[PDB]
Amino acid sequence: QVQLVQSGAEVKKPGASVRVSCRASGYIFTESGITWVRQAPGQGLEWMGWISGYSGDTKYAQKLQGRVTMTKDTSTTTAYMELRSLRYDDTAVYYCARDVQYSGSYLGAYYFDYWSPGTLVTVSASTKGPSVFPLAPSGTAALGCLVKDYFPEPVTVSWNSGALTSGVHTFPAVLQSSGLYSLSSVVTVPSSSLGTQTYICNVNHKPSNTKVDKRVEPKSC
Amino acid sequence: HGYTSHGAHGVAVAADLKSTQEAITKNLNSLSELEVKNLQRLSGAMDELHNEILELDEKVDDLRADTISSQIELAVLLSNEGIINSELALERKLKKMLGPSAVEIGNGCFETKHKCNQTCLDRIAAGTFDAGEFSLPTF
Amino acid sequence: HGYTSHGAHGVAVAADLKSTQEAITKNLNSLSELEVKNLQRLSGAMDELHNEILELDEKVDDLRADTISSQIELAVLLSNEGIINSELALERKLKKMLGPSAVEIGNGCFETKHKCNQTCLDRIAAGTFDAGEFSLPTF
Amino acid sequence: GKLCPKCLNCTDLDVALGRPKCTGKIPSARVSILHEVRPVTSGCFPIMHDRTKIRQLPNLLRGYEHIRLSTHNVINAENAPGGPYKIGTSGSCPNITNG
Amino acid sequence: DYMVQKSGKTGTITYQRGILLPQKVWCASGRSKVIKGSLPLIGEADCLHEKYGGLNKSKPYYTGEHAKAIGNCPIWVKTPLKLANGTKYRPPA
Amino acid sequence: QSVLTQPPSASGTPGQRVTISCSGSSSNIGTNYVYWYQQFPGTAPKLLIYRSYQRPSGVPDRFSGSKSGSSASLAISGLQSEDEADYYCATWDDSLNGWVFGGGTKLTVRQPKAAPSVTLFPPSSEELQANKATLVCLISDFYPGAVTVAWKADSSPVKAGVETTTPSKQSNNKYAASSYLSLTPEQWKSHRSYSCQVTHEGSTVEKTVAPTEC
Ligand SMILES: *[C@@H]1O[C@H](CO)[C@@H](O[C@@H]2O[C@H](CO)[C@@H](O)[C@H](O)[C@H]2NC(C)=O)[C@H](O)[C@H]1NC(C)=O
Ligand SMILES: *[C@@H]1O[C@H](CO)[C@@H](O[C@@H]2O[C@H](CO)[C@@H](O)[C@H](O)[C@H]2NC(C)=O)[C@H](O)[C@H]1NC(C)=O
Ligand SMILES: *[C@@H]1O[C@H](CO)[C@@H](O[C@@H]2O[C@H](CO)[C@@H](O)[C@H](O)[C@H]2NC(C)=O)[C@H](O)[C@H]1NC(C)=O
Numbered sequence: 001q002v003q004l005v006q007s008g009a010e011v012k013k014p015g016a017s018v019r020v021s022c023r024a025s026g027y028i029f030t031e032s033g034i035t036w037v038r039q040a041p042g043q044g045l046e047w048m049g050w051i052s053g054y055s056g057d058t059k060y061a062q063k064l065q066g067r068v069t070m071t072k073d074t075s076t077t078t079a080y081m082e083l084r085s086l087r088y089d090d091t092a093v094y095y096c097a098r099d100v101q102y103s104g105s106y107l108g109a110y111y112f113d114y115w116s117p118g119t120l121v122t123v124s125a126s127t128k129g130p131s132v133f134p135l136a137p138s139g140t141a142a143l144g145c146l147v148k149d150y151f152p153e154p155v156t157v158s159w160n161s162g163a164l165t166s167g168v169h170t171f172p173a174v175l176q177s178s179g180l181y182s183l184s185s186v187v188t189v190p191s192s193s194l195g196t197q198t199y200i201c202n203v204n205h206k207p208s209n210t211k212v213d214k215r216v217e218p219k220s221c
Numbered sequence: 222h223g224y225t226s227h228g229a230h231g232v233a234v235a236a237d238l239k240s241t242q243e244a245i246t247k248n249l250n251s252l253s254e255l256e257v258k259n260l261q262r263l264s265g266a267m268d269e270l271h272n273e274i275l276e277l278d279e280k281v282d283d284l285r286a287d288t289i290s291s292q293i294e295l296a297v298l299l300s301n302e303g304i305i306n307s308e309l310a311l312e313r314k315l316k317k318m319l320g321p322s323a324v325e326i327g328n329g330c331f332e333t334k335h336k337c338n339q340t341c342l343d344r345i346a347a348g349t350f351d352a353g354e355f356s357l358p359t360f
Numbered sequence: 361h362g363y364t365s366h367g368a369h370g371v372a373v374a375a376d377l378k379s380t381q382e383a384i385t386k387n388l389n390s391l392s393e394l395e396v397k398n399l400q401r402l403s404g405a406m407d408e409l410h411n412e413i414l415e416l417d418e419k420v421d422d423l424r425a426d427t428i429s430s431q432i433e434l435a436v437l438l439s440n441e442g443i444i445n446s447e448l449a450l451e452r453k454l455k456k457m458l459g460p461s462a463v464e465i466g467n468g469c470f471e472t473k474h475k476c477n478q479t480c481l482d483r484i485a486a487g488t489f490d491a492g493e494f495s496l497p498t499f
Numbered sequence: 500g501k502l503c504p505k506c507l508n509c510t511d512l513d514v515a516l517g518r519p520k521c522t523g524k525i526p527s528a529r530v531s532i533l534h535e536v537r538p539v540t541s542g543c544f545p546i547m548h549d550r551t552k553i554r555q556l557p558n559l560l561r562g563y564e565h566i567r568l569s570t571h572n573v574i575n576a577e578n579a580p581g582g583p584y585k586i587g588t589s590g591s592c593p594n595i596t597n598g
Numbered sequence: 599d600y601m602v603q604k605s606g607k608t609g610t611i612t613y614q615r616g617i618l619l620p621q622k623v624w625c626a627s628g629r630s631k632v633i634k635g636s637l638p639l640i641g642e643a644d645c646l647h648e649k650y651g652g653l654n655k656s657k658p659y660y661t662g663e664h665a666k667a668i669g670n671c672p673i674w675v676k677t678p679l680k681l682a683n684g685t686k687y688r689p690p691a
Numbered sequence: 692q693s694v695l696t697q698p699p700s701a702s703g704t705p706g707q708r709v710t711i712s713c714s715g716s717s718s719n720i721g722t723n724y725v726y727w728y729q730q731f732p733g734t735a736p737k738l739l740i741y742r743s744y745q746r747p748s749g750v751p752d753r754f755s756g757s758k759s760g761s762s763a764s765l766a767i768s769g770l771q772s773e774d775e776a777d778y779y780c781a782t783w784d785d786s787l788n789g790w791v792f793g794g795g796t797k798l799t800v801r802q803p804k805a806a807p808s809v810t811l812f813p814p815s816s817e818e819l820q821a822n823k824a825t826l827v828c829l830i831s832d833f834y835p836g837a838v839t840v841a842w843k844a845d846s847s848p849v850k851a852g853v854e855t856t857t858p859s860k861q862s863n864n865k866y867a868a869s870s871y872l873s874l875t876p877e878q879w880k881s882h883r884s885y886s887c888q889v890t891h892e893g894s895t896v897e898k899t900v901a902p903t904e905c
Contacts, residue, residue, distance in 0.1 A: 028507070030507060030508055031637070031638060035790075037790075041857075042856070042857035044693060044779070044792055044793070044794050044795050045728075045736065045779055045781070045792040045795075046792070047781075047789050047790035047791070047792070049789075054510065054637075055510060055535055055538070055539050056539065057535075059788075059789075060789075061789040061790075062787060062788055062789060074508050074541060095735060095736075100638060100640075101636055101637070101638075102534075102636075102637055102638065103500075103534030103535055103636055103637045104532075104534045104634070104635050104636015104637065105536075105634075105636060106636070107636070107783065107785075108723060108724075108782070108783020108790060109636065109651050109783075110636075110638075111724070111726055111738075111741055111742070113738060114738075115735035115736055115737070116735065117735060118735055131818075131821070133814075133815040133817045133818040133825075134815050134817060135812040135815060135827065136815060136816075142810050144812060144827070144829075146812070146815065146818070146825065146827060148818075148823075148825065169829075169831060169861075169862075169867070171829055171831075171856075171859075171867060171868075171869045172856055172859040172867075172868075172869070173856070174854045174855070174856040174869055174870075174871060175854075175856075176854050176871075177854070182825075182854075182871060183869070184812075184827055184829060184869060186810065186829060219816065219905050220905075221905045245681070245683055248681070249681065252658055252681070253658045255658065255673065257673055259631065259666075259667070259668050259669075259671075260666050260667065261631045261632060261633050261666045261667075261668055262533065262632045262633060262634060262666055264562030264563075264629060264630075264632060265559075265562070267552070267555055267558075267559075268536060268555075269552070269554070269555065270552060270555075272404050273402065273404035273405060273406075273410060273413050274413055276402050276403070276404060277402065277413060277416060277417060277420065280402070280417075280420055281420060282664075282665075282666065283397070283664075284397075284420065284423075284424055286664045286674045287396075287397065287676075288427050288428075288431075289673060289674075290673075290674060290675045290676045291428075291431050291676075292431075293659060293673060293675055293679070294675070294676070294677070294679060295431075295434070295435075297679050297681060299438075300681060301680075301681060301682040304681070304682050304683075305682055305685075305686060308685055308686075324460045325464075326460075326499065327452060327455045327456065328456070328499065500635075500637045500638070500639055501637070515624075517622055527628070528630050529630055529631065530630055530631050530632075530633070530646075530668060531630040531631070531632045531633075532632070532633055532634075532635035532636075532637070532639070532646075533632050533633070533634050533635070534635060534636055534637050536634075551599040552599065552600070553599055553600060556600050558632075559600075559602075560624060560626060561630065561632055562629065562630060562632055563626040563627060563628055563629055563630060564627070564628025564629055564630045565626060565627045565628040566624065566625070566626050567624075567625050567626075568622050568623075568624065568625075569622050569623045569624070569625055570622075571622075572621045572622065573620055573621065573622075573623050574619055574620065574621070576619045576621065579617075579619055581613075581615075581617075
């Protein structure tokens with residue numbers, strides 16, 4: 001059975017480097033190659049490069065020449081990918097894949113077959129509570145809570161300490177390129193309910209013991 | 222390719238099989254049996270050491286491909302010329318079985334003194350037409 | 361190229377423009393669009409050091425020029441053959457508008473039952489000649 | 500393709516240089532494919548490759564239809580000129596046994 | 599380093615301390631027609647093209663990138679060529 | 692910006708035949724073999740079609756590969772629930788000297804198609820006092836779950852400081868997602884208006900804010 005097994009998940013500060021391992025099983029390693037492909041979270045596939053299990057010959061993607069190095073070890077039938085000078089764009093899942101080609105110029109006349117499970121590399125966050133900002137209402141009316149810049153997940157949002165539930169939507173977090181999360185929560189309310197009724201979002205971020213009751217009130221000019 | 226009959230009997234149409242059978246495939250086989258030597262890397266070459274020799278190799282390859290290409294193009298051009306110019310013989314075969322009972326129009330047509338229906342035309346297509354039946358001078 | 365009229369009306373002369381227009385220039389353009397690779401000194405050569413390689417270079421150059429020359433000569437020869445053999449079609453166009461009112465002489469001439477003056481001939485040159493005017497069988 | 504297949508974890512240069520455990524039948528062909536433009540060793544003792552033409556040796560052998568390592572020896576090393584020689588060996592070059 | 603010795607001829611080496619004297623030696627004859635490919639070799643082909651790899655012979659000639667090729671091959675041509683199967687274009691009347 | 696162009700979304704009722712196109716150029720699809728990969732969420736992609744037309748073992752004849760000039764296409768016939776995934780085309784590109792991937796098409800086969808609700812929040816007064824500004828664009832109630840988001844400063848595109856989440860299956864098996872546009876108060880003040888436009892099934896829903904209005 002053709003197997004590929006990678007090293008564990010990694011987390012790194014920007015500027016450092018990662019070495020990801022790829023051990024091979026169930027085929028003649030010295031007559032195949034390895035490619036590497038990476039996938040930014042929620043994005044497409046980016047080819048990185050290939051290395052021969054027969055000769056150690058390599059070819060890297062133009063965008064990654066300089067920063068990447070691939071090596072391999074016939075003894076342990078293992079391949080390694082090194083990525084230097086990590087930036088936030090290098091946060092991705094790193095796959096290795098068995099590539100049928102092992103000598104001659106690498107020119108895409110062959111293809112890669114089986115993909116390994118994937119190793120995630122995260123390029124610095126250190127537990128911060130969120131900043132909570134009101135999203136003021138403009139007959140339905142929308143009002144919300146912006147929960148900015150926290151780590152790690154998850155925060156919790158209720159409205160009016162749980163007594164407001166009809167119309168509440170809390171959206172999943174977005175992960176900025178800064179490694180920090182933000183989410184939002186909206187209630188749709190009667191537009192006549194403004195002015196007489198109060199609205200408070202309750203934000204609970206347990207990992208930082210942050211608890212915030214934010215009053216969302218109509219804007220004046 | 223074939224022959225057509227006109228008149229108050231309607232319009233008759235027939236085909237000639239020998240013309241069709243004669244009609245290109247043989248020509249193609251002739252083109253397809255062309256054979257030429259291989260052009261591979263020379264064996265004492267050595268990329269690192271002798272580049273100049275190697276550059277000359279490249280030169281001889283390119284030159285070969287070019288020349289041989291020109292030759293082929295010619296063979297084809299000639300062949301097509303033949304195929305298109307040949308397209309007038311049926312005329313001569315038809316003229317053969319009449320007698321001077323018809324005049325050469327030059328339109329690829331003749332004017333026969335009698336009338337010719339479908340059964341009459343199939344007999345000319347088969348080449349079995351000789352008219353003493355419509356009694357007119359025989360070749 | 362053109363057509364001539366004889367008789368007791370004198371001798372009429374006319375010209376055909378389509379024949380003239382058809383008449384070589386296109387052929388020439390076809391010859392003139394031929395393109396061939398350059399043949400310059402090879403860059404790792406070195407006159408002092410590698411003469412032998414160099415002698416072979418010379419060889420490949422000379423051989424090229426020769427072959428390509430032969431090819432060209434052929435193209436021209438063929439082309440000229442066409443130009444000269446083509447020089448008989450006007451005959452067929454004239455035969456077209458008569459009827460069997462004239463006999464094929466084979467001299468490139470016909471004998472018409474009527475007389476043809478200059479104005480009559482310009483109409484054949486223009487291709488507008490159809491005679492029911494001189495009333496004789498029409499094609 | 501490969502100088503000798505069945506000499507596993509061996510490159511053609513390896514087979515050419517006669518690296519221990521890379522030896523085998525190098526069969527014959529009327530056609531060969533040149534896969535390594537700058538061929539490599541996969542082990543034994545460190546070579547300074549680039550200071551001689553040695554790298555092309557496999558591609559040279561490749562050019563021929565028939566190839567074969569020899570038998571015996573083209574010269575007795577121990578009796579060579581310059582005084583009796585012991586013959587040196589090094590780890591990094593293990594043999595059928597090891598050592 | 600290696601040194602080739604012609605058919606029959608002997609050879610010479612001069613040395614000081616640290617010499618590796620040759621022992622076993624390559625013996626070669628015949629000639630193989632070499633092309634620039636990249637393993638693995640998969641399946642069969644009529645033709646092996648240095649640019650295109652495996653190839654099967656379809657039409658007599660081909661257009662494209664030209665390079666060294668061995669086996670039963672189509673011939674390289676400057677332009678895609680057509681043999682005429684038909685008649686000259688005639689406007690209706 | 693992907694070299695190969697794949698529609699973000701493809702769909703069909705179960706049993707139907709849907710196609711996914713993949714649009715390239717001479718250097719890639721025109722001169723090279725096409726490959727197709729299928730990915731279920733949080734798994735490795737798997738080879739589905741190889742050398743433009745072939746099927747690996749395991750892959751049913753329901754999947755079919757096509758190629759014409761600089762464009763290839765994946766056809767999925769007899770559409771079934773387990774074909775819900777992302778489909779990626781890949782070919783070598785001789786111009787960029789490396790493999791290239793299409794953006795990936797999400798295949799949705801159990802609900803009527805619904806357009807997205809969009810609501811756009813300007814920065815709060817509170818946030819602007821902290822010298823920050825964020826535009827919040829919330830997208831909800833769309834199916835199937837694939838949208839693209841574009842932002843505008845007045846009427847010219849903005850790409851910097853944009854963070855969109857992958858869409859998330861929500862309370863009713865419809866989909867929702869969010870997008871943020873981070874600005875300096877400086878920037879926010881300098882424009883007449885800002886826009887969040889959400890494209891879904893070849894149809895755009897737009898929402899606009901103006902710094903001056905309340
Ligand atoms: C493989 O290597 C071993 C040593 O690692 C070789 O054994 C030596 O043999 C020589 C004579 O051939 C003796 O002088 C040494 O003392 C041996 N070494 C030891 C420590 O035993 C062995 O010959 C090699 N195998 C072959 C067949 O070449
Ligand atoms: C060239 O032609 C032959 C046609 O048979 C192909 O060889 C066959 O490939 C198929 C698999 O695709 C096998 O089922 C046959 O057994 C093969 N025959 C042999 C003897 O190998 C070959 O793949 C073709 N090459 C191409 C299309 O480039
Ligand atoms: C050239 O064209 C002719 C038709 O103009 C082709 O003849 C046809 O052949 C097919 C089978 O190959 C028949 O089904 C048709 O009935 C034929 N047409 C007629 C009217 O005869 C011919 O095959 C072509 N030549 C080649 C070699 O491609």
